[PDB]
Design a protein around this motif. Structure first.
Motif, PDB file in Angstrom:
ATOM      1  N   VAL A  94       0.845  -1.190   0.000  1.00  0.00           N
ATOM      2  CA  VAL A  94       0.000   0.000   0.000  1.00  0.00           C
ATOM      3  C   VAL A  94       0.880   1.238   0.000  1.00  0.00           C
ATOM      4  O   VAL A  94       1.939   1.283   0.659  1.00  0.00           O
ATOM      5  CB  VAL A  94      -0.998   0.051   1.202  1.00  0.00           C
ATOM      6  N   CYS A  95       0.444   2.243  -0.754  1.00  0.00           N
ATOM      7  CA  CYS A  95       1.225   3.461  -0.913  1.00  0.00           C
ATOM      8  C   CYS A  95       0.435   4.711  -0.525  1.00  0.00           C
ATOM      9  O   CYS A  95      -0.226   5.340  -1.366  1.00  0.00           O
ATOM     10  CB  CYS A  95       1.733   3.597  -2.360  1.00  0.00           C
ATOM     11  N   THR A 137       0.031   8.741   1.301  1.00  0.00           N
ATOM     12  CA  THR A 137       0.760   9.992   1.085  1.00  0.00           C
ATOM     13  C   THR A 137       1.888  10.115   2.110  1.00  0.00           C
ATOM     14  O   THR A 137       1.871   9.452   3.149  1.00  0.00           O
ATOM     15  CB  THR A 137      -0.159  11.227   1.169  1.00  0.00           C
ATOM     16  N   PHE A 138       2.832  11.022   1.846  1.00  0.00           N
ATOM     17  CA  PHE A 138       4.014  11.167   2.684  1.00  0.00           C
ATOM     18  C   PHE A 138       3.658  11.365   4.149  1.00  0.00           C
ATOM     19  O   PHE A 138       4.339  10.825   5.020  1.00  0.00           O
ATOM     20  CB  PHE A 138       4.820  12.400   2.271  1.00  0.00           C
ATOM     21  N   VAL A 139       2.632  12.178   4.436  1.00  0.00           N
ATOM     22  CA  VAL A 139       2.381  12.539   5.832  1.00  0.00           C
ATOM     23  C   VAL A 139       1.836  11.343   6.607  1.00  0.00           C
ATOM     24  O   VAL A 139       1.826  11.358   7.834  1.00  0.00           O
ATOM     25  CB  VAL A 139       1.424  13.752   5.991  1.00  0.00           C
ATOM     26  N   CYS A 140       1.398  10.312   5.877  1.00  0.00           N
ATOM     27  CA  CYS A 140       0.816   9.118   6.488  1.00  0.00           C
ATOM     28  C   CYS A 140       1.789   7.965   6.617  1.00  0.00           C
ATOM     29  O   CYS A 140       1.461   6.976   7.254  1.00  0.00           O
ATOM     30  CB  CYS A 140      -0.370   8.596   5.672  1.00  0.00           C
ATOM     31  N   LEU A 141       2.977   8.073   6.025  1.00  0.00           N
ATOM     32  CA  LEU A 141       3.842   6.893   5.919  1.00  0.00           C
ATOM     33  C   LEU A 141       4.254   6.292   7.251  1.00  0.00           C
ATOM     34  O   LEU A 141       4.215   5.083   7.406  1.00  0.00           O
ATOM     35  CB  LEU A 141       5.087   7.216   5.100  1.00  0.00           C
ATOM     36  N   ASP A 142       4.644   7.128   8.211  1.00  0.00           N
ATOM     37  CA  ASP A 142       5.137   6.608   9.481  1.00  0.00           C
ATOM     38  C   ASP A 142       4.026   5.861  10.218  1.00  0.00           C
ATOM     39  O   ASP A 142       4.246   4.759  10.735  1.00  0.00           O
ATOM     40  CB  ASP A 142       5.671   7.752  10.347  1.00  0.00           C
ATOM     41  N   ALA A 143       2.828   6.458  10.236  1.00  0.00           N
ATOM     42  CA  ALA A 143       1.681   5.864  10.928  1.00  0.00           C
ATOM     43  C   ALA A 143       1.253   4.555  10.282  1.00  0.00           C
ATOM     44  O   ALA A 143       0.926   3.591  10.991  1.00  0.00           O
ATOM     45  CB  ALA A 143       0.501   6.847  10.967  1.00  0.00           C
ATOM     46  N   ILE A 177       1.643  -6.780   4.914  1.00  0.00           N
ATOM     47  CA  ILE A 177       1.404  -5.584   4.125  1.00  0.00           C
ATOM     48  C   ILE A 177       2.661  -4.720   4.107  1.00  0.00           C
ATOM     49  O   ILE A 177       3.098  -4.237   5.151  1.00  0.00           O
ATOM     50  CB  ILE A 177       0.193  -4.782   4.655  1.00  0.00           C
ATOM     51  N   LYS A 178       3.227  -4.518   2.922  1.00  0.00           N
ATOM     52  CA  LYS A 178       4.393  -3.662   2.785  1.00  0.00           C
ATOM     53  C   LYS A 178       3.948  -2.253   2.438  1.00  0.00           C
ATOM     54  O   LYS A 178       2.799  -2.034   2.040  1.00  0.00           O
ATOM     55  CB  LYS A 178       5.339  -4.184   1.717  1.00  0.00           C
ATOM     56  N   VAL A 179       4.850  -1.292   2.595  1.00  0.00           N
ATOM     57  CA  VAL A 179       4.464   0.098   2.399  1.00  0.00           C
ATOM     58  C   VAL A 179       5.353   0.765   1.369  1.00  0.00           C
ATOM     59  O   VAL A 179       6.566   0.580   1.379  1.00  0.00           O
ATOM     60  CB  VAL A 179       4.531   0.878   3.750  1.00  0.00           C
ATOM     61  N   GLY A 180       4.750   1.525   0.460  1.00  0.00           N
ATOM     62  CA  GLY A 180       5.527   2.288  -0.497  1.00  0.00           C
ATOM     63  C   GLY A 180       5.253   3.778  -0.413  1.00  0.00           C
ATOM     64  O   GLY A 180       4.137   4.211  -0.092  1.00  0.00           O
ATOM     65  N   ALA A 181       6.283   4.578  -0.697  1.00  0.00           N
ATOM     66  CA  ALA A 181       6.110   6.005  -0.921  1.00  0.00           C
ATOM     67  C   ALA A 181       5.700   6.251  -2.377  1.00  0.00           C
ATOM     68  O   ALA A 181       5.954   5.417  -3.250  1.00  0.00           O
ATOM     69  CB  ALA A 181       7.405   6.759  -0.576  1.00  0.00           C
ATOM     70  N   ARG A 197      16.808   8.861   2.281  1.00  0.00           N
ATOM     71  CA  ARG A 197      17.163   8.478   3.651  1.00  0.00           C
ATOM     72  C   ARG A 197      16.026   8.723   4.643  1.00  0.00           C
ATOM     73  O   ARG A 197      15.964   8.048   5.681  1.00  0.00           O
ATOM     74  CB  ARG A 197      18.458   9.164   4.112  1.00  0.00           C
ATOM     75  N   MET A 198      15.107   9.631   4.306  1.00  0.00           N
ATOM     76  CA  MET A 198      13.955   9.885   5.177  1.00  0.00           C
ATOM     77  C   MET A 198      12.977   8.717   5.118  1.00  0.00           C
ATOM     78  O   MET A 198      12.347   8.388   6.119  1.00  0.00           O
ATOM     79  CB  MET A 198      13.245  11.185   4.805  1.00  0.00           C
ATOM     80  N   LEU A 199      12.822   8.124   3.938  1.00  0.00           N
ATOM     81  CA  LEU A 199      11.997   6.925   3.787  1.00  0.00           C
ATOM     82  C   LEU A 199      12.682   5.733   4.438  1.00  0.00           C
ATOM     83  O   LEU A 199      12.030   4.930   5.109  1.00  0.00           O
ATOM     84  CB  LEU A 199      11.728   6.627   2.308  1.00  0.00           C
ATOM     85  N   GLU A 200      13.999   5.616   4.249  1.00  0.00           N
ATOM     86  CA  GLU A 200      14.753   4.486   4.790  1.00  0.00           C
ATOM     87  C   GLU A 200      14.684   4.467   6.308  1.00  0.00           C
ATOM     88  O   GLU A 200      14.564   3.407   6.914  1.00  0.00           O
ATOM     89  CB  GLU A 200      16.207   4.553   4.323  1.00  0.00           C
ATOM     90  N   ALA A 201      14.712   5.647   6.935  1.00  0.00           N
ATOM     91  CA  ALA A 201      14.660   5.720   8.395  1.00  0.00           C
ATOM     92  C   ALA A 201      13.296   5.273   8.942  1.00  0.00           C
ATOM     93  O   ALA A 201      13.183   4.867  10.102  1.00  0.00           O
ATOM     94  CB  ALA A 201      14.986   7.136   8.863  1.00  0.00           C
ATOM     95  N   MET A 202      12.266   5.325   8.098  1.00  0.00           N
ATOM     96  CA  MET A 202      10.937   4.840   8.474  1.00  0.00           C
ATOM     97  C   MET A 202      10.723   3.393   8.099  1.00  0.00           C
ATOM     98  O   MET A 202       9.616   2.860   8.293  1.00  0.00           O
ATOM     99  CB  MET A 202       9.847   5.680   7.793  1.00  0.00           C
ATOM    100  N   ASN A 203      11.755   2.766   7.535  1.00  0.00           N
ATOM    101  CA  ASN A 203      11.686   1.380   7.060  1.00  0.00           C
ATOM    102  C   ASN A 203      10.663   1.144   5.957  1.00  0.00           C
ATOM    103  O   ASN A 203      10.123   0.041   5.837  1.00  0.00           O
ATOM    104  CB  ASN A 203      11.397   0.393   8.202  1.00  0.00           C
ATOM    105  N   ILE A 204      10.416   2.159   5.137  1.00  0.00           N
ATOM    106  CA  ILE A 204       9.560   2.039   3.951  1.00  0.00           C
ATOM    107  C   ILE A 204      10.135   0.996   2.979  1.00  0.00           C
ATOM    108  O   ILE A 204      11.360   0.866   2.835  1.00  0.00           O
ATOM    109  CB  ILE A 204       9.413   3.429   3.250  1.00  0.00           C
ATOM    110  N   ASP A 205       9.264   0.226   2.336  1.00  0.00           N
ATOM    111  CA  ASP A 205       9.718  -0.902   1.517  1.00  0.00           C
ATOM    112  C   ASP A 205       9.902  -0.569   0.038  1.00  0.00           C
ATOM    113  O   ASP A 205      10.870  -1.012  -0.599  1.00  0.00           O
ATOM    114  CB  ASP A 205       8.699  -2.035   1.657  1.00  0.00           C
TER     115      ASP A 205
END
Ligand code: NA
Ligand code: NA
Ligand code: NA
Ligand code: NA
Ligand code: NA
Ligand code: NA
Lengths: 251, 251
Positions: B42-43, B45-51, B61-65, B83-91
């Protein structure tokens, strides 16, 4: 000077800091800006907004987004809707930064739609404007900026217009051996105030806050803020270091 | 069919949902996709990625930006660094969506820089490609897409190339009375696989997952997935409704 306009210093972090780094910076900042004689805003990246806004609850530090779209929702992959910022209680949104106009096809038409959307969603817009090296050299600074202001603020009510924060960016000075002088900054900012007056009337012009958004460092802010028409600063790189940003806030 | 390629169904939410709405949707989705025979992404928006990433911990369920920049950090107001996505462990990260190529000056050169940055930051890129109505009508589909693939995947190692997920978007069919047929989709996707083979060799082509990214609904997915070269779907609007997305996942 005679006119009451709350000064505002906003830090545009641009593309810097993970969530934990962002929270660490605002935690450092809190005790350093608690006595500010101006409004204080920090603008982290989108992925950091929720964490940063939650971290600054109870303090005078307001939070801005660095961009948004103008529609409520829809088929705009990668974009953030005004209602997404509003649900996080974000205070400000930067619209029309030179970097987005240059790289990402931000137009005056989309800027105008975004400014209107800001007001519809309890966001205060920081509208960026400014001319290139070539435009300044050709003597077209005021014509160019007037075109931006005319288009970007089209259709606002007087009550909305006086709440816009306009940031003047001297793009012409970006990447050169000399920054704009405080007089050059003040002269163009006074011209912008005159553009606002012609559009919205004298009372609105008297009230609108206009920031300088060229190079702002701890050693430049006192002179900049002493100028007749400058109401604040949209700070770039110095906003990344807590002590440096606090020096600019405490001018 | 003979070749082992894990199928992948990714939901591109585009510009939809606040943080709480996003979390509510993934909470609804979790029990409906726990038995998926494919990879599920599931992908938001940016402001929702961490949550969202935190909400799906412990599940499949994996997560994409939906986008990112290619630099580590810098003067790119409004942009999100890898690196901001990587720090959130985005897939995953979607790169080159038609909407960003059309509205936001995404070029093949920037797509290539982003794909390389994805690999440098533990992100799997979903590279979008596809031709317009006019390009298809002029018989230039394969030349146009070859140019995109050549440029966008330039410089990757074989090991990186086989991990790219390519999504074919038939832009030509967007906003018309008829969607691409499953045969049209499969034919162009097989051509893309041939483009990959010419660039990286037969083994890489045999392994790369290629999704269809036109209109995907619960009533189209079974036929689409039965096609010889289609490895999944980049789903638009149907990804916004838990039950509909789960039907597509459970094809
Ligand atoms: Na001057
Ligand atoms: Na300066
Ligand atoms: Na002043
Ligand atoms: Na065909
Ligand atoms: Na279809
Ligand atoms: Na298949």
């Amino acid at each position: 000077g005679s006119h009451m306009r709350t000064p505002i210093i906003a830090g545009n972090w641009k593309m810097h800091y993970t969530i934990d780094e962002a929270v660490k910076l605002v935690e450092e900042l809190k005790p350093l800006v608690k006595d500010a004689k101006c409004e204080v805003v920090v603008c982290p990246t989108f992925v950091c907004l929720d964490a940063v806004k939650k971290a600054v609850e109870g303090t005078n530090i307001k939070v801005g987004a660095q961009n948004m779209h103008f529609e409520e929702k829809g088929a705009f992959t990668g974009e953030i809707a005004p209602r997404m910022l509003e649900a996080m209680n974000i205070d400000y949104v930067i619209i029309g930064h030179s970097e987005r106009r240059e790289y990402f096809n931000e137009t005056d038409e989309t800027c105008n739609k975004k400014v209107k959307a800001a007001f519809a969603h309890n966001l205060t817009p920081i509208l960026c404007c400014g001319e290139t090296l070539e435009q300044r050299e050709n003597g077209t600074t005021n014509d160019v900026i007037k075109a931006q202001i005319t288009a970007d603020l089209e259709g606002l009510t007087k009550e909305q217009a006086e709440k816009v924060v306009i940031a003047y960016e001297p793009i012409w000075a970006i990447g050169t051996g000399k920054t704009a002088t405080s007089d050059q900054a003040n002269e163009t900012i006074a011209a912008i105030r005159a553009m606002v007056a012609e559009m919205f009337g004298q009372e609105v012009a008297d009230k609108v806050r206009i920031q300088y958004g060229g190079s702002v460092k701890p050693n430049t802010i006192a002179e900049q803020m002493a100028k007749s028409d400058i109401d604040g600063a949209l700070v770039g790189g110095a906003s990344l270091v807590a002590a440096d940003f606090a020096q600019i806030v405490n001018y």
